[PDB]
Paper text:
As a standard structural component among protein nanocages, ferritin exists ubiquitously in both prokaryotes and eukaryotes. Structurally, the 8-mer protein is a heteropolymer that is composed of two different subunits (Hα and Hβ) that originate from the same polypeptide.
Analytical ultracentrifugation showed that the larger protein assembly in solution sedimented as a single discrete species with s20,w = 17.28 S, which is very similar to that of wild-type (wt) HuHF (s20,w = 18.8 S), suggesting that it is also a 24-mer protein assembly, so it is referred to as 24-merΔ3C. To obtain detailed structural information on 24-merΔ3C, we tried to crystallize this protein and eventually obtained qualified crystals suitable for X-ray diffraction. The second difference in structure between NF-8 and 24-merΔ3C is that NF-8 is a heteropolymeric protein containing equal numbers of Hα and Hβ subunits, while 24-merΔ3C is a homopolymer which consists of 24 identical subunits. Consistent with this structural difference, we found that the stability of 24-merΔ3C is lower than that of wt ferritin, namely, 24-merΔ3C can dissociate into subunits at pH 3.0, while wt HuHF disassembly requires at least pH 2.025.
Author numbering:
A (entry chain A), B (entry chain A), C (entry chain A), D (entry chain A), E (entry chain A), F (entry chain A): 5 to 170
């Protein structure tokens, strides 16, 4: 056992690992989205940039949670990073929608983590959920793209790319 | 009675107070509008900013009129600030229209104040109506949004947000 | 229902709204105080400034809680902002005392909000109570003004105005 | 009773005081360590500096908790600061080990404080445990010094002094 | 079929995808190594940094090859990113050795890609193998750590961490 | 015995230790005073600052005397730091008076140390009493606060706080 471990639950340890995998997965999703929009037959440079940045942000979450497991005296175990549910993301609107679904799910996993912490009386971990959320952020992007007429309007997706994401 | 009072009418004093309440009310209207457009299902960031600024401007009017009442030797009395006539402002165009109606009304109250001053031979107060008006300003915004096709066109409200209000 | 809502309680939604009204009310109280002290027969410029700043601070709280309701997928509903309990605040000491009573009350409402969050297992909201309190701050001002001899000593209120609030 | 007190428990008040004494004690431990290593027959300048800094950090914790007790309307009561468990700290490795034991103990006292807060529904205090911990930090130093061959290797303690602590 | 495709082989397309997966995998290996050395019971900060940088470098390769597939008119298909062959990397020397084995393997896959290009007369792809290799770089690190006495000498791994990787 | 010891008396060694404890004690007294005046029902910010600085100064003396014991080849032994004679310091004037009594006592202990040095023909130690005294400094503060009417005059303590200590 670790010298620096103290009131860290064996189930807390496993919960952390699951989230790490979870956050790496979201990073892969956003990576896959980004290069979809880099395609010569999709060609939305700012979507591509936008999701490429969100890919970095989630990999950074995984690293924070890795920096957790280690700080708390636990042991990092890494699983396969499963490939995303799509190769073709169809439209900017569709990816924005998929990303909204993904983040709500990731958030739900964090709420569970936070509950487990509370019930194991682990206040340092409940705080390590040091988030600030982009759920509204994609929320907003989805609303706008719909009102502009996406995805049937190809003008809509093109402009939003220049004006909101530019 | 006040040492610094001089040719300030008891009806002038009450008229000022009514306007103060009036100007605070307009500030609340613009506050309520601003956060309507901050909604994830409305998502017009620049409307939101625009009305949030107009909220500050009207609260500032109220403070000028408060700084009046006091300067002139009168006594500030504050009423309830009644909540706006809507929670849902429907569209950017609709708020712009509502705001136009509101400002014309507030202006009408100022003209009455100015008349009362003139008939009480109160030249310092008639001047304290030191305005410069945004009635045309919303006038212009309304015209444009209509010609673009609001509110049926969701593209129209989105672009105007970026281009005129940006 | 909202796309960005998730584990936000309908009673959480109403609780937020009550606080918003509550925080706007405190802003109105401090506004009313400020211009009391701007009176030619009270004439404490730094009290006036001091409470005018606290008015801004509370309106800013209301806006943060508005920025909440919206982020969480809830719906802002605004009530009347009821006028303060006084027009005449009597003395600097008396306003400082009234303000202390007001802030303790507002704080009590926040503790209730925080409890409700905890019992609805709403960790994002319990944190949104991102305060740092001025209860001691008026606490200190009250102690000093009393020891100087307020409000019977008119010298006391005048000096404190220059020295602590200057 | 205090004007600025509100939902602060009499047992919360005593718990704070115990921690204050606790944190001052850790400061004395690190002070005693620092000047051990300043000895002409120990002569590890960077250990000496390192623990002298940690002495400042803990005295600073005590002051934060003092600034608590006062803010919350409670009353500071100070006990004797008991002298450390050693005059001779033996080796750099041994002090690092002792310090690890000390910090885990101090941390355990904080977890208890945090629990008490939670059970007294005192959210402002549970947060005032605004830490970020050096338990891993000495954890790391201990691991390295062991692998280098401390304390039998006098070369090891000398180099680590220059290279990790320099 | 794509408008911008020209002399890009369907087997060239699949070969690219395999390499992308390959390069992402190496990134995961270096990520897993980095946080191994961030452990309180391993505690080699500069190994940790070193492999964390190499993680970034390989993810960057994957992105270049993604930027390929797309440029050439092909279609990106992403597989699972399989978790590394170890959780415990044992020593700095052992990871350096594992990383050497990994890079030789990745290099072998690139030589095959380059051969396939040549035999499909695909000169733009044979060039896209725009590398400059760190095989010698870990080669050198391995030689030094061995000569210092790794991994039995814990002094050796500690110093190399400060002196070569610092 | 120490290699760097020379004409340092075993009674000189014990005398130093007593002073170290003595100087740490004065630091604790000034710490306890400082946070007394930080109380919401005392609220003299500049007293609080003033004594907090004097706390730092005395802890610094202790460290100089520690840096002595070590330089001279002696051995530091630390006792309990006994808690001050008061929790409630009553008034600014009263603390200033208590502090004057404390410093005269600490000074008397230094004169004894200096005598012992002289009689043991220890000129390096008699010099290490490298002081410059604040006995007059509190002397002056006491005189002023009395003439202003402390502690019955609460105006007096408040002004002196702003004007002499500001
Ligand atoms: Mg995330
Ligand atoms: Mg107006
Ligand atoms: Mg507030
Ligand atoms: Mg501590
Ligand atoms: Mg590579
Ligand atoms: Mg002294």
């Amino acid at each position: 056992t670790s010298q620096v471990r103290q009131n860290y639950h064996q189930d807390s340890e496993a919960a952390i690992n699951r989230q790490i995998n979870l956050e790496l997965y979201a990073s892969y999703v956003y990576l896959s989205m980004s290069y979809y929009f880099d395609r010569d037959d999709v060609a939305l440079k700012n979507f591509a940039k936008y999701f490429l940045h969100q890919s970095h942000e989630e990999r950074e979450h995984a690293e924070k949670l890795m920096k957790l497991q280690n700080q708390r005296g636990g042991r990092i175990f890494l699983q396969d990073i499963q490939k995303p549910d799509a190769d073709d993301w169809e439209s900017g609107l569709n990816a924005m929608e998929a990303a909204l679904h993904l983040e709500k799910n990731v958030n739900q996993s964090l709420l569970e983590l936070h509950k487990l912490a509370t019930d194991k009386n682990d206040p340092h971990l409940a705080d390590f959920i040091e988030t600030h959320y982009l759920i509204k952020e994609l929320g907003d992007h989805v609303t706008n793209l719909r009102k502009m007429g996406a995805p049937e309007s190809g003008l809509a997706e093109y402009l939003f790319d220049k004006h909101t994401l530019g």
